Amino acid sequence: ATLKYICAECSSKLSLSRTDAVRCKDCGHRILLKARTKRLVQFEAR
Amino acid sequence: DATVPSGRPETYIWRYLPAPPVCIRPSVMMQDSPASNEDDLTVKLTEI
């Protein structure tokens, strides 16, 4: 959710330290995305 | 014609070798890391 990133398969939210671990907690799976901010953004529809 | 320099066709065999200026054939730079790209003339004559 609000926190930093997500698994690939687990879709399990997780946060991480630096030079820490590539694995998530629950997944024996590696790759992970980065969650979208709470920061406001803008488009214009036209 | 033998005016001076051409001082007779004792020129036409190599007794001394002009080395190409560095500016002509640069060793490609190190470009992010320790990999340093050679250049053939540099390498060949530098074996000469």
């Binding site: 980065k34 979208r36 901010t37 | 190409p20 002509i24």
Partner: protein
């Protein structure tokens, strides 16, 4: 509804493809490999011993993939799509049993791992193999990827099917001057080897074999072939009376004038003139030194012990060459497929593999050597796990190979290039598009006119549409929909089986023979030329379609050449269609109800003897009709369907048969470049450059082929309302023109997912690289030069991100580049940072970023950007019909017509496009479309068929539009009746690559190349353009000097050189440097390119010392 001959045949090709997949050609090969090949390939070398240790050996037995003997299917392996993100190679380890010797009483087997095999998607051993819609989902990959390609390093590559000149059969080609080069070049396992033959001069004919010395009188060799006849020798190759009598005899003359009785003489004339044994095992130096190689020099094909087989074979070669050596034509040309046998992916992988593994074993001997050098105590200890250290040159080397595109074969020392490609994903079509493409090779230099024409025999067995201009090092072709490529079958059964028909051994034959009937040939090898050819062929072809040796192992006869041919050869093109039974088909029209019922399958026709695969030569014998409507009892076969003629891509063309082939060419070549759905997996995969379409739509009309490849489920294009008119005289040539507040309403809208990748690599300095950032001065805000990232200091999801800024910050240490020592105190803290700017001509967004790692345990970030391009002016819209066009001026709304329902002709094309370029299929297709929208149907109109036109009129007239597409309209500007009715109605247009916004490029002052300091090359790196010779010479003819003096002088390289009148050379500053001078120098201007030219010259030995003159003073 009873089944109808008009309707029924159509269900076949799909039902044909329903089971046997669209691409088996990369599949069943690769599958065949992982069973047949390796189980045989090691069975070649199962045993190795170094020269030492009388009692030792290493005995191979088992080869498998993905089974350690636990379960049947591999228990687990990494998911392929997931792997596509990790940049790994998607592969399975090898498991191998070897029982072997080490020391007293061992002879012990285990399961061993030589390494991993780079497997292929949707193979036997694939994960996705037998996967239904769920393992798809959970395994995060689209069902509709056709498969049949490899993936290595996370990129995606395909072995392109390599067409190879057919191998090991006699080809003889007449040629001007010369004397008609003949050849047969044979390869089996070891030693692919070529032997040409030809006349030298004026009837005087000799052997060239690069093995032999050269130029050997042939009939002399024919004696050396063991036949002593000297009568039949003529009589065999010659004929009876006719012409041939004299023609060959001159040979016999010069054959007679020297020697005779080969038994020593001739034979050891060859052993006398020949290359040496190459040192060792010249113990065979003899008269029979050649007698060994007499069998093996040219042909591995036969060998055996006495020569009469091989002899009479060679004689037969002599026959055909003296035959048309009598008269031109009457010669084989390399055009028809029968002389070109392509070989699919699987076989190539073995050929490559077995030699890799070859080098492996060979050096593994060398490995165990250093074990048995020095016998301290008792050394056994198997030295097996040393296979690890010695492994994976097989594995990783093979990766490097398949990724390279260049294969090095150290057995043959033969190296082929451009063997693979990056899979092209611009569409869904593109994927399977470059799959099922065919590369050519060889054909000497280009100017030979051979690699040019597209022949009649090409019918149905190669796409009649796309053969694009990418010729270069080869020739690109395509399979049709239905092409089976029959692999090798087997030999001995057909050999002794033909004998079961009662054919006679060569040995039982009358010497003078060829007079009687025609001939029999196995793969080009004659046996008896049995009597009674017809009923022979009938029975045989029957036996195939009935009891044995199905598919190929075909038969075809000849008159001109008296023969008949049966081959087991692999790598051949085959096509199905229906045998006529007497006057009509074998299906009896009720059997397709016995098909559509659901219990038939396919090949049931084959095994039950209805239809089967064919061949060029084969079908060149047979007689086929088009439709069941036209059928004659004199016929033989009949096609299932006409529309199998065009291939996958070409099937997209609606009503192809109404359009000139020049159009189907460009339309196929471009169609692969359209943009659209890709695949369901879309948004979970990350590509370097991957387009898409915002609102895809089904093309209003269907070509039956589209339903076959499941095309429309992945549409690429727009179903558009189009008028044909001259409106807004911007139209002119091929320029289209659009509607605003349509594209505004949305239309044609695009997104481009691009990517950037960064490998964080650690350093022997024991110092990694840091991703930190986000300085944020003033507390005010992260600096606009940077900003934009987030607390992590990396690009944020979904943010407008602009040129000059950084979406990813990579930094390495400055001391990281150098040689570390284990002496340190505090600061690694020095970091040279090279955060990569996103350059570009417009805004962009980041919707995905990935922090992940490869096998080697080092941090990695591969991210992607997307920007939605509005299909603005300059872009390329096409017709799917062969109209390549660029959108011109865009019109707001009010203008362009409306008419009765006020519909707006969204895309208004040009009249002069069609007629003089002449393509009616688009035009009629329109009518088909405006029909389709009525009764509310997707509509056929497939090739040679589908929807008739005449009905569609009645289909419109009831709803009250013209029986043409024509209609009144009203001036978009002036608002009144248009003078001429306008054909228009909905059609389907699409947007290609070549977005204008990429290619618009300009350079004010850009970089200069290290060497020439001029305008760095191309686009990308940076700008600057190319004025070449041919273009340059133009400006001469205008007499303009100053355009040159500006052009190749000032703004190319603006440069001064310091030169000296005395001893003219190029110095600098204050010296001529040959003469210590500081005086005579004249500062002046020359192209820096020119200085470069001098110094090069003068760097070699030469001097163009200059002379100077007053510019003024006359």
């Amino acid at each position: 509804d009873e089944i109808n001959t008009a309707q029924d045949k159509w269900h076949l090709l799909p039902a044909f493809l329903k089971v046997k997949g669209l691409v088996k050609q990369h599949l069943d090969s690769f599958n065949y490999f992982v069973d047949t090949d390796l189980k045989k390939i090691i069975k070649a070398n199962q045993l190795i011993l170094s020269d030492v240790d009388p009692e030792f050996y290493l005995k191979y037995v088992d080869i498998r993939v993905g089974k350690k003997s636990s379960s049947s299917t591999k228990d687990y392996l990494t998911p392929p799509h997931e792997c596509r993100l990790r940049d790994m190679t998607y592969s399975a380890p090898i498991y191998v049993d070897i029982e072997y010797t080490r020391g007293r009483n061992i002879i012990m087997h285990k399961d061993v791992e030589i390494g991993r095999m780079p497997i292929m998607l949707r193979s036997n051993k694939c994960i996705l193999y037998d996967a239904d819609e769920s393992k798809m989902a959970k395994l995060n990959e689209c069902p509709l990827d056709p498969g049949g390609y490899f993936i290595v390093n996370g990129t995606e590559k395909v072995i392109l099917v390599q067409e190879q000149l057919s191998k090991n059969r006699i080809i003889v080609e007449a040629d001007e001057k010369k004397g008609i080069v003949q050849a047969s070049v044979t390869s089996s396992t070891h030693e692919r080897k070529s032997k040409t033959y030809v006349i030298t001069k004026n009837g005087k004919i000799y052997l060239k074999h690069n093995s032999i010395a050269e130029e050997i009188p042939i009939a002399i060799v024919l004696k050396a072939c063991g036949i002593l006849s000297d009568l039949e020798i003529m009589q065999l190759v010659c004929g009876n009376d006719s012409s041939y009598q004299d023609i060959f005899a001159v040979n016999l003359e010069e054959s007679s004038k020297l020697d005779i009785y080969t038994q020593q003489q001739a034979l050891e004339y060859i052993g006398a003139k020949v290359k040496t044994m190459r040192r060792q095992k010249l113990t065979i130096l003899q008269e029979g030194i050649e007698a060994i190689a007499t069998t093996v020099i040219a042909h591995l094909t036969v060998e055996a012990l006495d020569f009469r087989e091989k002899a009479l074979y060679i004689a037969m070669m002599t026959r055909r060459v003296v035959m048309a050596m009598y008269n031109p034509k009457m010669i084989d040309d390399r055009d028809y497929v029968g002389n070109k046998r392509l070989e699919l992916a699987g076989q190539l992988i073995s050929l490559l593999f077995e030699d890799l593994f070859k080098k492996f074993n060979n050096d593994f001997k060398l490995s165990i050597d250093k074990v048995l050098k020095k016998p301290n105590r008792a050394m056994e200890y198997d030295a097996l796990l040393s296979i690890n250290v010695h492994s994976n040159n097989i594995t990783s080397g093979l990766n490097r190979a398949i990724s390279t595109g260049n294969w090095s074969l150290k057995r043959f020392k033969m190296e082929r290039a451009g063997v693979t490609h990056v899979l092209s994903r611009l569409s869904y079509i593109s994927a399977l598009g470059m799959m099922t493409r065919i590369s050519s090779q060889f054909e000497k230099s280009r100017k030979v006119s051979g690699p040019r024409a597209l022949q009649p025999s090409q019918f149905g067995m190669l796409c009649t549409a796309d053969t694009p201009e990418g010729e270069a090092c080869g020739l690109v072709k395509n399979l049709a929909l239905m092409t089976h490529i029959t692999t090798d079958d087997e030999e001995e059964p057909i050999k002794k089986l033909c004998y079961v028909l009662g054919v006679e051994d060569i040995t039982l034959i009358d010497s003078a023979s060829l007079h009687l009937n025609y001939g029999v040939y196995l793969n080009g090898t004659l046996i008896g030329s049995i009597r009674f050819p017809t009923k022979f062929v009938t029975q045989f072809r029957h036996l195939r379609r009935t009891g044995k040796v199905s598919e190929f192992i075909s038969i075809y006869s000849n008159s001109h050449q008296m023969a008949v041919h049966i081959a087991t050869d692999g790598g051949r093109i085959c096509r199905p269609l229906i045998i006529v039974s007497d006057g009509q088909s074998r299906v009896k029209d009720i059997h397709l109800r016995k098909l559509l019922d659901g219990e038939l399958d396919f090949d049931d026709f084959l095994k039950l003897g209805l239809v089967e695969y064919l061949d060029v030569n084969e079908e060149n014998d047979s007689y086929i009709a088009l439709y069941e409507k036209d059928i004659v009892p004199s016929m033989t076969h009949l096609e299932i369907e006409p529309f199998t003629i065009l291939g996958a891509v070409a099937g997209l063309i609606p009503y192809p048969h109404h359009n000139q082939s020049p159009r189907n060419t460009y339309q196929c070549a471009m169609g692969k470049q359209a943009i659209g759905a890709i695949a369901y997996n879309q948004f979970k995969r990350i590509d370097t450059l991957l387009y898409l379409m915002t609102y895809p739509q089904q093309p209003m009309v269907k070509t039956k082929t589209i339903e076959l490849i499941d095309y429309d489920k992945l549409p690429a294009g727009q179903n558009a309302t189009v008028a044909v008119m001259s409106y807004s005289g911007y139209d002119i040539e091929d320029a289209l023109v659009l509607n605003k507040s349509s594209i505004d309403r949305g239309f044609g809208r695009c997104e481009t997912r691009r990517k950037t990748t960064t490998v964080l690599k650690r350093y022997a300095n024991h110092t990694q690289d840091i991703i930190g950032g986000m300085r944020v001065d003033e507390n005010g805000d992260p600096i606009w030069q940077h900003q934009s990232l987030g607390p992590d200091g990396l690009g944020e999801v979904g943010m407008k991100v602009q040129s000059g800024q950084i979406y990813i910050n990579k930094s390495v240490p400055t001391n990281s580049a150098d040689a570390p020592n284990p002496n340190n105190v505090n600061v690694q803290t020095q970091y040279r940072e090279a955060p990569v700017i996103y350059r570009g001509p417009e805004p962009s967004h980041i919707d995905q970023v990935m922090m992940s790692v490869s096998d080697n345990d080092q941090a990695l970030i591969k991210v992607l950007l997307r920007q939605n391009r509005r299909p603005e002016l300059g872009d390329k819209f096409s017709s799917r019909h062969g109209q390549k066009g660029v959108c011109g001026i865009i019109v707001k709304q009010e203008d362009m017509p409306f008419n009765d329902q006020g519909i707006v002709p969204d895309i208004i094309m040009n009249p002069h496009g069609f007629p003089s370029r002449m393509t009616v299929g688009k035009m009629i297709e329109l009518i088909s479309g405006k029909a389709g929208v009525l009764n509310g149907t997707l509509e056929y109109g497939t090739c040679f068929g589908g929807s008739k036109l005449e009905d569609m009129s009645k289909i419109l007239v009831d709803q009250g539009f013209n029986y043409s597409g024509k209609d009144m309209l009203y001036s978009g500007i002036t608002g009144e009746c248009l003078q001429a009715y306008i054909f228009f109605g909905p059609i389907y247009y699409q947007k290609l690559k070549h977005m204008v916004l990429d290619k618009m490029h300009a350079r004010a002052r850009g970089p200069r190349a290290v060497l020439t300091r001029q305008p760095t090359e191309g686009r990308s790196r940076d700008g600057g353009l190319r004025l070449g010779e041919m273009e340059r010479d133009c400006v001469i003819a205008y007499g303009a000097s100053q355009l040159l003096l500006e052009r190749l002088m000032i703004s190319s390289d603006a440069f001064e050189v310091d030169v000296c009148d005395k001893c003219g050379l190029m110095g600098y500053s204050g010296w001529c440097t040959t003469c210590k001078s500081a005086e005579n120098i004249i500062k002046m201007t020359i192209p820096y390119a020119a200085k470069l030219l001098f110094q090069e010259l003068l760097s070699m030995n030469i001097a163009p010392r200059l002379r100077l003159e007053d510019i003024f003073q006359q």
